[PDB]
Design a protein around this motif. Structure first.
Motif: not given
Ligand SMILES: [K+]
Ligand SMILES: [K+]
Ligand SMILES: [K+]
Ligand SMILES: [Mg+2]
Ligand SMILES: [Mg+2]
Ligand SMILES: [Mg+2]
Ligand SMILES: [Mg+2]
Ligand SMILES: [Mg+2]
Ligand SMILES: [Mg+2]
Ligand SMILES: [Mg+2]
Ligand SMILES: [Mg+2]
Ligand SMILES: [Mg+2]
Ligand SMILES: [Mg+2]
Ligand SMILES: [Mg+2]
Ligand SMILES: [Mg+2]
Ligand SMILES: [Mg+2]
Ligand SMILES: [Mg+2]
Ligand SMILES: [Mg+2]
Ligand SMILES: [Mg+2]
Ligand SMILES: [Mg+2]
Ligand SMILES: [Mg+2]
Ligand SMILES: [Mg+2]
Ligand SMILES: [Mg+2]
Ligand SMILES: [Mg+2]
Ligand SMILES: [Mg+2]
Ligand SMILES: [Mg+2]
Ligand SMILES: [Mg+2]
Ligand SMILES: [Mg+2]
Ligand SMILES: [Mg+2]
Ligand SMILES: [Mg+2]
Ligand SMILES: [Mg+2]
Lengths: 125, 175, 175, 49, 205, 97, 110
Positions: A33-47, A49-51
């Motif tokens: 499921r594509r993350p869609k939260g405003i603060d999501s680390r996974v959506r923002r592609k921090f190193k 984290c989940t790919l």
RNA sequence: GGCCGCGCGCCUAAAGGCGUGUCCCUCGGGGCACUGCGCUGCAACGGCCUGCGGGCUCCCCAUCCGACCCGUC
RNA sequence: UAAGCAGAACUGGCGAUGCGGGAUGAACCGGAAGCCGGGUUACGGUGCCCAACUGCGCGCUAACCUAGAACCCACAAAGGG
RNA sequence: ACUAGCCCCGAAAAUGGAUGGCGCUGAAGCGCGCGACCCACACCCGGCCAUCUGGGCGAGCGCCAUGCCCCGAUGAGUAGGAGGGCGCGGCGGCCGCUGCAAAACCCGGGGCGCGAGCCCGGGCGGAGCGGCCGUCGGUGCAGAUCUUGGUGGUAGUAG
RNA sequence: CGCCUCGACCCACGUUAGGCCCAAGGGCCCGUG
């Protein structure tokens, strides 16, 4: 028969994209499921984290959908559907459907031996 | 850096090349897929270059295999490109063999082998397929032991294995 | 050499007012020619009233030491900017080239006064006879029987291949 | 290509003769100003005016 | 700084007259690379800055303590070998398993206890005081700092070290007699096989 | 060296390597520039068709300079990289080409 | 001295220091290796291209043997002081850093 | 580090390669050249193949590096 | 008075953005991005933590005040020796 | 006498403490240089996926022409828009499966797809189910102090 | 303290404004199967 495919099959990722935090919660399933939260680390592609899946991971068009035995799969339900692979027996392999009985599996496996069509699950049931 | 095809001559090969029109040359089964037939390749792969420090009669240290470290005399470079070597079999126990150019080190010590006949030894002689081999080995050492005895201490040198010891830097040693 | 001496020649652009303008020359110290011409146009703008946009660059030539194997005494008159104000000072150096003296001057100003290269203006350079040297530490090297030991030896291997982390005994050094 | 190659020389050489002759009679020869530039961008595309 | 590369079982370093932080820096790299290091005579390590500066540095360190439970807080070791052990630990990722293994390969001692009294002890050239410090600048010994802040085994270390040096001085006299005998033996054996050793002449030192 | 090693043309708004002279002919033939030597001569000696020849050249994609830079933030006369070096651009082309 | 074991040694002993690294991430595709006796970047070029073997003892037997081998080669120097970059068929386990490696001379230009 | 699409219808030569005539160039020996039709996926060698062998996208653990709990205003 | 205060002008940035450096940090410096292999750089660094010199060279400093040591930035003055 | 570098005085706060730490004194400090090296998802060369641009293919030995082949550049995304796909349940059609074992459920089983998902194997179970085209809808959950039901730790504790 | 169901070769103290030295950059070892 003898597989016609000669280009080596390369995979850009032999690994699944498991849904973020599905390890943390029992009720969360692993289907992506594509993350869609405003603060999501996974959506923002921090190193670290989940790919996230993207189109750059896609596989070569010449080798995509080819099974490890270098054939492409076609699911059959009876003998007549298996006859359609006789002219493509070098590029296509036959898989008997999961709910086909043992009596009909014998008939399909016999006909495929005559036609030199490879059946991937011929020893089943 | 020579340009072989520097000039559009192409006739120093076929001088009398003004020739006539070329004459171009049941399946019992049809493969259902248009597969281009496999014919033999007409490419010449330009045989391998011998290292300039390896010359007939020079000594080689073997770097790998069951004879690693054996000091061995070099005889000839075969058509495939493998070097032909002999121990000789009397001193160190290394028979006639062909070795890759890698896995050997060319030392600066040399032996004259001019009056030694190494002709019947070639790639076909080593084809994977022995009494006469013992004879050929026997008749190639006695032609070479004497030349080894010609140089002082060369016999005990060839009968000893090379090894690295404490403080030895292979990138500084002269050999 | 880090610093080079150049002779830069230029003038104001020939205009119908004059059409044969005056020629200006400078001896400037810079690391290359591009930096020498920029410093020339800096002084022409500030000392004369000719800036690069209204001027013409005629020639640029590097000056070289006549005898780079002897030792000269070199006086330098300079202008430098400190944190609070401007001051001029006179410095003396001993070198085989005036290039070395200018590199010495720039290094000394950086250390003793924390003055960088932009904040320095070389007013005048010259060679001084040893009879007329003014600063100490230049006269004391005018002894013809000059003799002293080397009080700091810098024990080190010669070519970095002989470097080891450990040694079996402490070094013995003497002077 | 032969014509161009021989034109690069006799242009470098001529400038060597012109400068020498200017010093020969005691003057300065001024080299022609450059007509060509090679320009390479050394900064990135972030935060641009 | 990389490792020594000497790939031995264990290197014994005579720590006398080395700079403390430069010695600890090199040793820490050796341990992290897999070498076992034994440091002896840690009581004679030197630190630049005299006793006064080094003593107040320890006193400031001695000030640090968990206000609510001191036995949890920083542990202030007084012995020279434990002081050097803690200096090295500060240069190692010791909260990881790799740094835990690295620090387990270090042995530090005051004096030279057996069996290292009869082994070879090396020196680190780029940690020696004679090459690192100007001759006029102040410094102190680790044992002097340790004695000033609570270490109480300086006397037993000194008494043991005098006994060891007596035994080594006797072994040195014996080795000199055997060396003179050796030089006579190689002189007599030189002529007896004079012809054979011609190839050794140009490389005789 | 720039035009040989990193030469690309603009044919139908596409970046085409100057691997043969037909590319230069089909691009600049109407301006009497036939091969890669005529192209080099036009650029080096800024001629009547420099505008057509230069614009026909796609911008050169140079690699990161081998050996690095000094200070990209200030000028060449300050000891940095920006500005005019006037002859030392050739030393910079050596390491970027 | 009467010793047992290997009779000749045709390799030099290297030690694995780690991975190609920065301050904040690391790369397993290349290992950093210190070779005994190699002290400069200049004399590293002799060893460039030389084959390398990492030898470790596994827990089970494979070919009636309890020792496994991973092969690599020296790729280039690393820094000024003789450390080299090495590429193995599979990336070396991080547990192998600090251990010993064998540097051969098998591909020989001399 | 990633890639594998010249050679023969003249002769000799393991093979790389050599061997014809014409005009010009000088200072010893080359250079530019004759251009006529066709066919046109680089190699050599080794170990192994039902085994304590090979592989793995699966499970567990170790190590190094990276990594703060999601949603929301 | 000032404020991490309150209000305007031009531009950029964050918000909406990861990635390298500034130990750490929305905004500072570098630089913006499909999945990878090889080569090289930016900013910033090369005693250890930490990848890279205890590199080559000249001075200055001695801190018995916790000497000093990375833009923003994590303070210091008049005045003295 | 003056001038200006580094250093010292001027210089005091409450948990124990922070040039990031250890430490460093011909520095591992300060000012200035030299050579090499390290090092980003940035730049270069190469492979693959997608987007966009531009092309080729019939008196068709001729093709999911909605296809295939060739060329070049490009790829950040909240709010938001759009396209193409995946999955659920019916209806009209077409093609099938199943007591020689359908649906559902379980599995450190094997694969395909970037992904939503799909296909097969083994088991349980014992009677129904699927795929393709069209069309329709009460059609996809992690949150709402969300509803209903079930179940933990607290805890063999308070008592 | 008592009671028993891959040659892994090598020992000086001490001093560097001093004890031939100017690094183990050495020495030893069939080092040879
Ligand atoms: K909210
Ligand atoms: K439907
Ligand atoms: K006991
Ligand atoms: Mg997959
Ligand atoms: Mg089934
Ligand atoms: Mg910027
Ligand atoms: Mg390091
Ligand atoms: Mg106490
Ligand atoms: Mg480089
Ligand atoms: Mg830089
Ligand atoms: Mg800026
Ligand atoms: Mg907002
Ligand atoms: Mg926000
Ligand atoms: Mg790379
Ligand atoms: Mg230093
Ligand atoms: Mg900070
Ligand atoms: Mg003051
Ligand atoms: Mg810091
Ligand atoms: Mg790419
Ligand atoms: Mg996008
Ligand atoms: Mg959105
Ligand atoms: Mg389970
Ligand atoms: Mg259904
Ligand atoms: Mg309904
Ligand atoms: Mg609903
Ligand atoms: Mg729910
Ligand atoms: Mg939700
Ligand atoms: Mg609730
Ligand atoms: Mg409820
Ligand atoms: Mg409860
Ligand atoms: Mg109770």
């Amino acid at each position: 028969a003898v597989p016609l495919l000669t280009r080596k099959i390369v995979k850009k990722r032999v690994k699944h994209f498991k849904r973020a935090h599905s390890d943390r919660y029992i009720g969360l399933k692993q289907s992506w499921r594509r993350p869609k939260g405003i603060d999501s680390r996974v959506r923002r592609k921090f190193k670290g984290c989940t790919l996230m899946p993207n189109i750059g991971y896609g596989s070569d068009k010449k080798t995509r959908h080819y099974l490890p035995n270098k054939f492409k799969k076609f699911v059959v339900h009876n003998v007549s559907e298996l006859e359609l692979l006789m002219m493509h027996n070098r590029t296509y392999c036959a898989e008997i459907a999961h709910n086909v009985s043992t009596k009909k599996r014998k008939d399909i496996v016999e006909r495929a031996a005559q036609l030199d069509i490879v059946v991937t699950n011929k020893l089943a049931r | 850096h020579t340009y072989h095809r520097r000039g559009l001559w192409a006739i120093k090969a076929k001088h009398g090349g003004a020739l006539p029109k070329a004459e171009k040359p049941e399946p019992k089964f049809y493969p259902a897929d248009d597969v281009k037939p496999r014919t033999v390749s007409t490419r010449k792969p330009h045989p391998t270059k011998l290292r300039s420090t390896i010359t007939p009669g020079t000594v080689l240290i073997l770097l790998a295999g069951r004879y690693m470290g054996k000091r061995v005399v070099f005889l000839k470079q075969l058509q495939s490109g493998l070097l032909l070597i002999t121990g000789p079999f009397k001193i160190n126990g290394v028979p006639i063999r062909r070795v890759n150019q890698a896995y050997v080190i060319a030392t600066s010590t040399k032996v004259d082998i001019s009056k030694v006949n190494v002709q019947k030894f070639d790639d076909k002689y080593f084809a994977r397929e022995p009494d006469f081999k013992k004879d050929d080995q026997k008749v190639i050492d006695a032609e070479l032991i004497k030349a080894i005895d010609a140089v002082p201490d060369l016999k005990n040198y060839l009968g000893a294995r090379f090894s690295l010891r404490d403080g030895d830097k292979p990138h500084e040693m002269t050999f | 050499h880090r610093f080079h001496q150049y002779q830069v020649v230029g003038r104001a652009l020939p205009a119908p007012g004059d059409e044969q303008p005056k020629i200006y020359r400078m001896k400037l110290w810079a690391t290359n020619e591009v930096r020498a011409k920029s410093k020339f146009w800096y002084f022409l703008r500030k000392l004369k009233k000719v800036k690069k946009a209204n001027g013409q660059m005629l020639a640029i030539n590097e000056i070289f030491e006549k005898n780079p194997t002897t030792i000269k005494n070199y006086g330098i008159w300079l202008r430098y900017q400190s944190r609070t104000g401007y001051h001029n000072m006179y410095k003396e150096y001993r070198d085989t080239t005036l290039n070395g003296g200018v590199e010495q001057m720039y290094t000394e100003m950086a250390s003793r006064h924390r003055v960088r290269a932009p904040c320095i203006q070389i007013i005048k350079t010259a060679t001084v006879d040893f009879k007329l040297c003014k600063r100490d530490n230049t006269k004391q090297f005018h002894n013809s029987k000059i003799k002293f030991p080397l009080v700091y030896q810098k024990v080190r291997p010669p070519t970095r291949k002989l470097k080891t982390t450990y040694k079996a005994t402490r070094p013995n050094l003497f002077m | 290509a032969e014509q161009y190659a021989g034109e690069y020389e006799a242009q470098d050489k001529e400038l060597v003769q012109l400068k020498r002759e200017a010093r020969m009679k005691g003057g300065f020869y001024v080299s022609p100003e450059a007509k060509l530039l090679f320009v390479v961008r050394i900064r990135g595309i972030n935060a641009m005016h | 700084v990389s490792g020594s590369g000497v790939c031995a079982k264990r290197v014994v370093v005579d720590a006398r007259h080395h700079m403390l932080g430069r010695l600890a820096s090199i040793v820490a790299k050796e341990l992290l690379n897999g070498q076992r290091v034994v440091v002896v005579r840690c009581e004679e390590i030197c630190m630049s800055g005299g006793l006064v500066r080094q003593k107040m540095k320890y006193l400031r360190f001695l000030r640090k303590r968990m206000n609510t439970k001191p036995s949890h807080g920083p542990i202030h070791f007084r012995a020279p070998a434990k002081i050097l052990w803690r200096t090295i630990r500060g240069m190692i990722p010791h909260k990881t398993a790799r740094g835990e293994a690295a620090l387990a390969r270090l042995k530090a001692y005051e004096g030279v206890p057996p069996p290292y009294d009869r082994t070879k002890r090396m020196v680190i050239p780029d940690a020696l005081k004679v090459l690192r410090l100007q001759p006029g600048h102040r410094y102190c010994l680790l044992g002097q700092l340790s004695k000033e802040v609570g270490w109480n085994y300086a006397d037993t270390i000194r008494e043991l070290e005098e006994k060891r040096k007596e035994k080594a001085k006797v072994s040195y006299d014996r080795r000199k007699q055997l060396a003179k005998l050796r030089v006579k033996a190689e002189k007599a054996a030189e002529e007896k096989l004079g012809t054979q050793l011609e190839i050794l002449a140009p490389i005789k030192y | 060296e720039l035009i040989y090693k990193r030469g690309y043309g603009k044919l139908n708004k596409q970046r085409i390597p100057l691997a043969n002279n037909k590319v230069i002919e089909e691009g600049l033939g109407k301006h009497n520039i036939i091969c890669i030597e005529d192209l080099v001569h036009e650029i080096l000696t800024v001629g009547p068709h420099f505008k057509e020849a230069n614009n026909f050249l796609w911008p050169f994609k140079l690699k990161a300079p081998l050996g690095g830079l000094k200070k990209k933030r200030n000028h060449y006369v300050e000891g940095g990289d920006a500005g005019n070096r006037e002859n030392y651009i050739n030393q910079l082309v050596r390491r970027m080409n | 001295k009467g010793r047992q074991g290997q009779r000749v040694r045709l390799y030099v002993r290297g030690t694995i220091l780690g991975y190609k690294r920065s301050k904040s991430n690391q790369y397993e595709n290349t290992s950093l290796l210190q070779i005994e006796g190699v002290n400069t970047k200049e004399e590293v070029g002799w060893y460039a291209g030389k084959r390398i073997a990492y030898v470790y003892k596994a827990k089970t037997k494979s070919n009636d043997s309890t020792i496994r081998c991973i092969w690599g080669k020296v790729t280039r120097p690393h820094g000024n002081s003789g450390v080299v970059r090495a590429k193995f068929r599979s990336n070396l386990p991080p547990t192998s850093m600090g251990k010993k490696v064998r540097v051969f001379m098998y591909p020989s230009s001399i």
